[PDB]
Amino acid sequence: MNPKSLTRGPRDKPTPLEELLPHAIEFINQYYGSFKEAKIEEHLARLEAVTKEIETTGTYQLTLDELIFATKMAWRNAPRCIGRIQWSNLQVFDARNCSTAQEMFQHICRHILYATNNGNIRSAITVFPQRSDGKHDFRLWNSQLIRYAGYTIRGDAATLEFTQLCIDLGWKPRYGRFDVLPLVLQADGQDPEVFEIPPDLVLEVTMELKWYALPAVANMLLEVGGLEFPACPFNGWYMVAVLHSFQKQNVTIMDHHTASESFMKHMQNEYVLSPFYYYQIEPWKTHIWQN
Amino acid sequence: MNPKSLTRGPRDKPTPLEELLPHAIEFINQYYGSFKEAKIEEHLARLEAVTKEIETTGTYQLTLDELIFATKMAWRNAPRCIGRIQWSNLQVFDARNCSTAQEMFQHICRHILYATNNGNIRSAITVFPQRSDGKHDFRLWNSQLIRYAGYTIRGDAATLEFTQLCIDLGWKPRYGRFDVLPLVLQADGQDPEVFEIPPDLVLEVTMELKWYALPAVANMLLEVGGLEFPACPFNGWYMVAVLHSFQKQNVTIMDHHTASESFMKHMQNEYVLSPFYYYQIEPWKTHIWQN
Numbered sequence A, B: 001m002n003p004k005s006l007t008r009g010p011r012d013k014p015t016p017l018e019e020l021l022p023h024a025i026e027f028i029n030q031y032y033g034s035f036k037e038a039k040i041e042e043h044l045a046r047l048e049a050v051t052k053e054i055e056t057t058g059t060y061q062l063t064l065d066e067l068i069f070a071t072k073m074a075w076r077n078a079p080r081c082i083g084r085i086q087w088s089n090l091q092v093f094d095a096r097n098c099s100t101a102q103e104m105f106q107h108i109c110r111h112i113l114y115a116t117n118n119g120n121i122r123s124a125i126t127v128f129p130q131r132s133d134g135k136h137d138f139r140l141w142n143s144q145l146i147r148y149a150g151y152t153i154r155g156d157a158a159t160l161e162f163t164q165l166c167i168d169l170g171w172k173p174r175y176g177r178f179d180v181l182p183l184v185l186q187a188d189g190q191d192p193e194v195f196e197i198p199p200d201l202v203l204e205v206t207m208e209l210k211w212y213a214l215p216a217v218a219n220m221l222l223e224v225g226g227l228e229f230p231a232c233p234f235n236g237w238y239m240v241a242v243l244h245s246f247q248k249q250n251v252t253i254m255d256h257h258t259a260s261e262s263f264m265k266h267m268q269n270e271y272v273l274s275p276f277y278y279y280q281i282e283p284w285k286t287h288i289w290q291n
Ligand code: HEM
Pocket: A071, A075, A078, A079, A080, A081, A082, A083, A084, A090, A123, A124, A125, A220, A234, A235, A236, A237, A238, A239, A254, A277
């Protein structure tokens, strides 16, 4: 067998042009190929413009239309995602001009607000700046946007390490079993900063014990045309008393009705794999602290 | 850290009385507190009248005097606004009895006319109806009242998405690089309607290439005493050859003379932050089309 690695690690220098160029061209091809017989001259013009941009700047920038296409195709290319059957139902937030952790925080608040939608969950992805030389990475250190702290264990067991990490960074822990972890945000390669999520932004389902309604993956990397975006949180909705509690509180889960309706909406939008979502190495294992 | 979200999203039901009430009371307090030792009996009477109005109607209405105060304090509370140093220089237009998109259009024409003032720019805000149940929102889909369309890019790059949106809505594009976008106006929660701004209302500075003289933010939400106003466009004036072109054409910018004179005028008027201007989620990402 020759499976590929599902992890894409850090770099300490820009991607070499001889490597980036062919990848960029292959992506531009799959983008314009999605127009069948249309836009041959547009395809060539874009090829020419990207090549000169790479040769002059060392990299290139996607158009927002190309970015939206990439995020949806990477979702389609996700092997284990049940949700990928309706891949066209995705809202993209473009945060590629983001510069600070405080700005990252506001983008994430926007995402949580929109996606939670008072329970009527919507799928969304927020895309922060692509990797340049790999020393200025944007990253979310969280594994999910919303998750409970873990501390005889109290809270979520799978967060024990991250919870201690937040505490080390100055986060003041309560010791409940449903404490929502803070956001730990790294911008432009700097040391992470800690941001409490405003409680009103966290919708929870009461089991009739409780659980948060928004499942959002915070820690993966989007690869597209040789470009890498190491910060790109996305969310879908969840797939017992839980089955009853979510429906009774009007929070979306993937029951048969939702499966049918979301596929129907997808279907109306018609009126090595790449692009791809990669796992990364946990950033606290690779980060060089500056202070 | 525990920063607050700078975005305030949609609702699908009225604000609960147990939430609105304390907010209303706190605002009434800051309003009457602006009178120091004066009007204690007036303060109590207003508290009593607002409470009964909330308990009987589910909401309450600001007096125009309270509204003027709120708009000026929210401006004072705007962290990044250089202009907030002279917050008392603000003309308020009360459009809270507005019902249709056509009426919205006429209010906006009035605003542009008054604020442009043939180049001698005046700061103004126009306040449309507050949010009720959140299904009848007034919104301007534009980010600014005046902005050029973007389409190899032709025009403003940051409007490409909105420009395509107008085109989708039946707007017939020229393909110049200084096409003024139409107003896209939603009234009472209905689908937006498209209105060309009368060309004579748009003052432009010629660079001695050109640019519009009136910078007006169209898309923010004013919060005051628990009430939300999701349509409340405001304008100030602008902060190279541009510096020369504006002064030569007698269009106000914030040069030292204007800084001094506007502060002087402000100074003569003496002879979680709330109220506050929030960002919103772009309405085309949240709107449910009715037809
Ligand atoms: C509409 C809701 C969605 C549902 C019901 C859904 C469901 C799932 C499920 C059940 C898993 C496996 C979880 C596990 O094994 O622990 C998964 C994995 C994943 N999902 Fe989703 N998903 C949805 C939306 C999304 C979106 C919006 C994206 C990205 C734009 C996405 C990308 C992924 C990725 C990258 C993985 C890992 C795939 C792999 O390793 O093969 N999903 N999803």
